[PDB]
């Protein structure tokens, strides 16, 4: 349950991310691949090499999803209907990986928005990513 303050925090947070969201997405994927090499069994057709266009590209894709989820902080289930259709019925990504993508997202955020990455921001952002992973894995069964 996102609190108005969380929503506010998120908006704030990501507001900052601004034009580097794609770069971050990119960074966070690369970061997941390295730290949790099992997350890779889902991208056998990618070039997981440092600075790959596939990862860059994909980095972009996710960043954007994230973005849309923020402006729609209030109606995620609806805004991410298609992504959850895809992940539940096509991709079929095991839920625990979301926990890993999310961690990774926050590692990168913190490394990049020091002044903004406060305890309460951190908290909101944990909750939100958590919120979106919940959306993404709800049509699982």
């Amino acid at each position: 349950m996102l609190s108005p303050a969380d929503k506010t925090n998120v908006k704030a947070a990501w507001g900052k991310v601004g034009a580097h969201a794609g770069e971050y997405g990119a960074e966070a994927l690369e970061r997941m691949f390295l730290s949790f090499p099992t997350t890779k069994t889902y991208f056998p057709h990618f070039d997981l090499s440092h600075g790959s266009a596939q990862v860059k590209g994909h980095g972009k894709k996710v960043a954007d999803a994230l973005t849309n989820a923020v402006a729609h902080v209030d109606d995620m289930p609806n805004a991410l209907s298609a992504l959850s259709d895809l992940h539940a019925h096509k991709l079929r990504v095991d839920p625990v990986n979301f926990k890993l993508l999310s961690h990774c997202l926050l590692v990168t955020l913190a490394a990049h928005l020091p002044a903004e990455f406060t305890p309460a921001v951190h908290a909101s952002l944990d909750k939100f990513l958590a919120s979106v992973s919940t959306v993404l894995t709800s049509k699982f069964r």
């Binding site: 960074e27 690369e30 970061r31 390295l34 730290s35 949790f36 961690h103 926050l106 590692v107 990168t108 913190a110 490394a111 990049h112 020091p114 990455f117 406060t118 305890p119 309460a120 951190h122 908290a123 944990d126």
Partner: protein, 146 residues
């Protein structure tokens, strides 16, 4: 852990630059803040009502340098986290009754704090390294649970 010679130095050298006091206090501070339920164990600390109220608590900060210390010490026996943590392992279970799960949370929170602190320096591969340690440490503390 299954730390690469190479991975063992990255870990080793970053840590070298750690302000134990500072890092210590913020990781535990952020623990309680990001995962409220973790405070069910530090009732005794006082006002944990608010972020600033948590981050501010000196009993909190104090406890933090204490934990980081143990961590710090365990990084020097990376070939034997198991034996290093056995006594502490029995404590959290037999005395504290902390579910091994919270260990994992802290791990992450320390990663986030380090990420926070070193910016650029906190590279993917170097994150890749610490991740493996927070991993081993967490696991070693969980070891003696029954």
């Amino acid at each position: 852990v299954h730390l690469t010679p190479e991975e063992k130095s990255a870990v080793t050298a970053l840590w070298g630059k750690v302000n134990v006091d500072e890092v210590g206090g913020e990781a535990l501070g952020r623990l309680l803040v990001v995962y409220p339920w973790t405070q069910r164990f530090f009732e005794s600390f006082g006002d944990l009502s608010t972020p600033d109220a948590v981050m501010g608590n000196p009993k909190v900060k104090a406890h933090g340098k204490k934990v980081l210390g143990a961590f710090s010490d365990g990084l020097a026996h990376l070939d034997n986290l198991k034996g290093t943590f056995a006594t502490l392992s029995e404590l959290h279970c037999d005395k504290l009754h902390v579910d091994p799960e919270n260990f994992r949370l802290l791990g992450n929170v320390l990663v986030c704090v380090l990420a926070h602190h070193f910016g650029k320096e906190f590279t993917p591969p170097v994150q890749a390294a610490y991740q493996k340690v927070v991993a081993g440490v967490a696991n070693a503390l969980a070891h003696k649970y029954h």
